[PDB]
Amino acid sequence: PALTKSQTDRLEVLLNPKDESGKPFRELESELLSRRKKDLQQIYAEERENYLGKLEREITRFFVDRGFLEIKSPILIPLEYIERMGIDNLSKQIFRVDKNFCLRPMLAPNLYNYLRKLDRALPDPIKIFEIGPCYRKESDGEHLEEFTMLNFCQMGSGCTRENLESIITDFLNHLGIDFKIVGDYGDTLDVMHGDLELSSAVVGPIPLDREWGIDKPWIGAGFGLERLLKVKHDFKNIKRAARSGSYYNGISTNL
Amino acid sequence: PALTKSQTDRLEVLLNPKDESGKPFRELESELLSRRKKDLQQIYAEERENYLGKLEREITRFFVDRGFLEIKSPILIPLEYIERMGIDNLSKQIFRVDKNFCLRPMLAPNLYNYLRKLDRALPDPIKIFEIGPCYRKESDGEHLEEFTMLNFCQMGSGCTRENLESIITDFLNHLGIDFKIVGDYGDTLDVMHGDLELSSAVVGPIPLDREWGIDKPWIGAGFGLERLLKVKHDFKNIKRAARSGSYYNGISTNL
Ligand SMILES: CCCOC(=O)NCCCC[C@H](N)C(=O)OP(=O)(O)OC[C@H]1O[C@@H](n2cnc3c(N)ncnc32)[C@H](O)[C@@H]1O
Ligand SMILES: CCCOC(=O)NCCCC[C@H](N)C(=O)OP(=O)(O)OC[C@H]1O[C@@H](n2cnc3c(N)ncnc32)[C@H](O)[C@@H]1O
Numbered sequence: 001p002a003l004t005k006s007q008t009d010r011l012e013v014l015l016n017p018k019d020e021s022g023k024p025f026r027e028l029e030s031e032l033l034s035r036r037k038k039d040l041q042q043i044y045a046e047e048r049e050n051y052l053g054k055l056e057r058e059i060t061r062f063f064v065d066r067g068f069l070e071i072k073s074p075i076l077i078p079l080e081y082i083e084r085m086g087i088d089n090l091s092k093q094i095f096r097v098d099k100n101f102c103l104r105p106m107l108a109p110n111l112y113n114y115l116r117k118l119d120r121a122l123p124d125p126i127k128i129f130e131i132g133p134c135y136r137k138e139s140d141g142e143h144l145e146e147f148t149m150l151n152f153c154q155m156g157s158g159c160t161r162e163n164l165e166s167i168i169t170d171f172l173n174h175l176g177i178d179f180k181i182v183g184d185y186g187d188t189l190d191v192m193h194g195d196l197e198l199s200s201a202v203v204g205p206i207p208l209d210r211e212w213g214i215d216k217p218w219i220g221a222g223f224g225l226e227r228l229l230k231v232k233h234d235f236k237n238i239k240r241a242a243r244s245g246s247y248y249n250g251i252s253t254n255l
Numbered sequence: 256p257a258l259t260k261s262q263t264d265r266l267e268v269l270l271n272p273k274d275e276s277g278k279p280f281r282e283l284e285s286e287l288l289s290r291r292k293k294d295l296q297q298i299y300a301e302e303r304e305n306y307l308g309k310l311e312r313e314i315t316r317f318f319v320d321r322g323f324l325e326i327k328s329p330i331l332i333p334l335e336y337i338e339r340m341g342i343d344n345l346s347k348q349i350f351r352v353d354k355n356f357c358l359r360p361m362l363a364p365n366l367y368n369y370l371r372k373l374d375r376a377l378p379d380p381i382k383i384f385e386i387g388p389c390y391r392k393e394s395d396g397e398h399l400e401e402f403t404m405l406n407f408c409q410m411g412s413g414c415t416r417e418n419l420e421s422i423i424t425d426f427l428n429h430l431g432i433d434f435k436i437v438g439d440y441g442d443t444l445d446v447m448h449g450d451l452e453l454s455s456a457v458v459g460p461i462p463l464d465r466e467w468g469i470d471k472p473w474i475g476a477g478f479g480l481e482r483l484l485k486v487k488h489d490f491k492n493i494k495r496a497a498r499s500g501s502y503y504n505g506i507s508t509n510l
Pocket of ligand 1: 106107108109111112115136138142143144145147149151153197198199200201202218220221222223224225226227
């Protein structure tokens with residue numbers, strides 16, 4: 001009669017945010033399975049684009065159109081970059097590779113490097129952004145160990161908290177994601193969606209800048225793409241938005 | 256009078272495939288520096304798109320339009336997948352992470368998984384592709400340790416060597432890359448550009464398939480994006496096309 005907790009989990013896996021007691025487990029499952037196969041069939045026949053890849057392309061067009069240079073830097077970076085970011089023995093939340101490298105847990109390091117180098121060639125202000133894989137050993141989850149970050153930044157003139165909030169606002173209203181900016185330069189703003197942190201943004205300059213050869217004011221923000229997708233598609237668990245073999249655009253692939 | 260080998264290397268770094276003795280090093284360098292800054296300035300003012308990111312988007316549109324489903328799977332995969340690919344103690348060319356994972360050296364594993372799972376929901380034939388970071392400890396270089404692979408595959412009907420060659424041909428003529436297919440099912444074709452291997456393609460089925468729960472015929476090919484860019488932009492060294500802090504669209508960032 002009553003579904004076991006295990007059966008309920010199984011059905012939840014097959015449940016979509018938009019689906020709407022009695023009937024036995026096998027029938028409820030057979031029903032959801034047919035719906036999910038049809039969903040996949042519709043995607044394969046029409047769209048064919050992956051949510052994460054498509055979001056990245058949409059975000060890229062948004063920043064490129066607003067004057068930001070598109071950066072693609074290494075994912076495997078020197079461990080020294082992590083120390084240089086002020087993270088000495090969070091240090092174990094780092095995925096290490098070999099003796100001197102690791103999987104970037106964030107984008108700041110390579111972006112700092114580009115800001116410094118580009119300043120010798122580009123007119124002020126320097127505007128850049130990167131979208132790509134970042135890695136952090138996790139606990140909760142909202143928390144993926146493998147995720148995708150969008151980090152944009154501007155250095156030089158126009159680097160005010162007001163301009164930063166304006167970019168964030170246009171960006172999220174563009175994506176159709178509800179949010180609230182919270183704070184109270186050297187400032188740190190938290191872009192929230194309910195209790196979920198969408199982004200921790202900062203208005204420089206900050207003491208860390210010196211360690212990277214940066215001496216100008218700057219503004220920047222980092223957003224996790226899977227979180228945006230989770231909020232956007234009303235996914236209950238963020239793993240439905242992650243690179244995975246278990247879900248395709250939020251649809252279970254275990255059919 | 257004569258440039259030292261070190262000065263020549265420096266100038267080569269600043270040299271673009273399209274630039275065309277006497278003058279002293281400092282003057283030759285100052286000349287190249289101004290040109291490179293202008294190049295970067297033109298990119299920042301107009302395009303703003305990264306070569307690698309832009310190629311990925313172009314390849315994606317190409318396969319999506321031809322009926323292939325866009326896949327974004329994990330970059331950090333179980334070490335077991337490598338053994339399962341038939342690579343037992345090349346095994347040390349693998350970047351290991353923690354005790355049970357590694358950085359994917361290729362895309363086949365996750366694509367095999369998707370072919371198996373999608374077959375339970377999608378009509379024949381199943382066509383999918385992925386574009387993303389792959390990692391392999393290297394020696395030569397043509398050889399990056401961090402690169403980007405495009406792997407597409409079709410399973411079920413239509414999986415002939417002829418159809419495979421046709422896709423490869425349309426793809427490369429589309430990108431404007433000269434090539435030659437060489438070979439002699441269970442077939443392996445090498446797509447060459449002069450002496451450079453652009454892709455090692457295969458016509459299944461192959462014995463390995465069974466280990467992945469795949470029992471249908473299939474065709475597939477893997478192309479390294481940095482190599483395509485290298486050939487396309489006539490870069491002398493492939494590192495000019497890689498994710499890097501040292502080059503931006505083939506232009507030195509050490510100005
Ligand atoms: C000049 C250049 C230097 O720029 C900076 O130094 N800082 C720019 C300000 C941007 C913040 C920085 N990129 C950052 O990493 O903030 P934080 O680490 O708290 O993470 C920001 C966002 O990444 C996402 N995120 C994090 N970990 C996860 C996870 N495990 N799963 C899913 N989503 C996640 C989430 O959106 C989180 O709010
Ligand atoms: C059903 C699914 C299973 O599909 C398959 O099992 N096989 C599909 C056939 C595709 C070949 C496979 N993806 C592969 O990896 O072939 P191979 O490892 O020789 O590499 C293919 C290409 O990757 C590129 N590549 C490699 N290593 C580098 C490097 N270090 N720097 C730069 N470029 C590089 C280069 O283009 C090379 O030819």
